[PDB]
A = this chain, B = another copy of it.
Amino acid sequence: GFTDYKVADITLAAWGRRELIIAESEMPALMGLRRKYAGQQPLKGAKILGCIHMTIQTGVLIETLVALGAEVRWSSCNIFSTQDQAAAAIAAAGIPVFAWKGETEEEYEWCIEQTILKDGQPWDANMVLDDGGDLTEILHKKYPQMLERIHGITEETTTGVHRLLDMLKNGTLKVPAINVNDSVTKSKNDNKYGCRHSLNDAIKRGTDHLLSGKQALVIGYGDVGKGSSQSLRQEGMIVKVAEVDPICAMQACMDGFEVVSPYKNGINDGTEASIDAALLGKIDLIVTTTGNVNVCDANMLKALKKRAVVCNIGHFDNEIDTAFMRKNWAWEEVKPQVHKIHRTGKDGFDAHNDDYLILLAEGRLVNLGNATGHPSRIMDGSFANQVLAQIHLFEQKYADLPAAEKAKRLSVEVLPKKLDEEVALEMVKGFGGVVTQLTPKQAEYIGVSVEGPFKPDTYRY
């Protein structure tokens, strides 16, 4: 009689379980931790509030935390990213999960609140796992008494880390955090290669458009922008890249992309006349990858080629000025998470109007909204890091420290390189790769231990 959940359709659970069993075989680092630590139960007593895309991959993460002794209460960190068969499988396993694909904003907030509260009162949570910082922010704003008893936060993504560092700077961060994003087996695996796999995946599922031979503009060339640019270029798109960071721009040039700005001489002065109309009028697809605000603005949207596709693979939808489009233009749903936006006016549209843009996932994270996000074998790396980070902060027991010791430990840190390398080694073995062992003479010659770490902490890979 388990009822402590809310999902779209519990009868999807058997299908979700079939897919979890497949995913397990694709996630050797994560399942390796499950097998290594199951006897020790290092998360016995852990009670984790989790807020991250309720995908099949997150399913394997949840069940690893539980297998290691944790209890959890779970929600998605995006209204469109849940895979309903994954949510159902977790619910059918007796795990509290409040998530479905296609939440409203009110429902999204209600789902987070159902993890925070059990039977109408604060759950006895003592750990947080977050992706983007929304759960973290709600706890700090609305539930400070709960944070007194929480040992730490493990944060998945660049945007969430930025929010933690802002709190730390302001003196408002209440518990320590591990930045999971900046393991190399996360940032330079998930953020880059994950988007390489899943960006063109989501565009094909949403539109079935041919991409080869067409013009793309990728805004940003960080890890997500690098992977996104490659996702499109490997399909044969002619890809131009915009950047504010000249070092990232240099990389894009050297990687074989033309670097362009939407604005004449790069000057974003807010006028229509600043838009490079010739450029925007040639673009068939624009993808935002920045984690910034309004990088595909109203004037770019007005100047885009007729029937261009617009999408965002950064964490939040405000990378695109969808507010402007809702205020001024008529939306025609093609199918879920695919809308034609008719620039002919607000009050209705002609079904055969040629002047429209196609928006994917209403501007929300397109890989998760229009496909299934990153593949299991990539999320393996991220989620092995999550499990290790949860173990580290739970074993440190920050909430039980005296005030003077808390002050010494209140920080945002990354996992040590030795763990990063060990996660990587399990990923490489999963491909059947064979890593060479240094001889003692070689290890002495380059000044490392035979078992690693093999690089100083400054190394950029």
Which of A's residues lie within 8 Å of B, judged by CB?
15, 18-19, 21-22, 25-26, 56, 162, 165-166, 182, 184-185, 187-189, 193, 196-197, 201, 204-205, 207-215, 233-238, 242-263, 265-268, 270, 282, 290-295, 307, 332, 334-335, 340, 351-352, 354, 358, 371-372, 375-378, 381, 420-422, 424-425, 427-428, 431-439, 441-442, 445-447, 452, 454-455, 458, 460-461
Contacts and interface: CB of A to CB of B under 8 A. Distances in A.
A256 B243 contact: no
A215 B258 contact: yes
Nearest to A267: B437
B266 A435 contact: yes
Given A208-B372, A424-B246, A261 B445 contact: no
B259 A428 contact: yes
Nearest to A192: B254
11 contacts: A15-B335, A18-B332, A166-B447, A184-B250, A210-B377, A213-B256, A235-B256, A247-B461, A260-B433, A266-B434, A294-B439
Contacts of A433: 213, 249, 252-253, 258-260
A331 to B, nearest CB: 13
A106 to B, nearest CB: 25
A431 B213 contact: yes
Nearest to A420: B247
Contact of A210 (B26, B162, B458, B460): B26
Contacts of A19: 334-335
Interface centre among A162, A242, A247, A253 (most CB of B within 10 A): A247
A452 B248 CA distance: 13
Nearest to A429: B246
A435 B249 contact: yes
Nearest to A194: B210
A454 B26 contact: no
A264 to B, nearest CB: 9
Nearest to A290: B446
Contact of A435 (B56, B165, B259, B458): B259
Contact of A184 (B261, B381, B437, B460): B460
Q: A-B pairs with the 10 shortest C-beta distances?
A: A259-B433, A236-B256, A213-B253, A246-B425, A210-B375, A210-B377, A246-B424, A245-B454, A460-B460, A234-B234
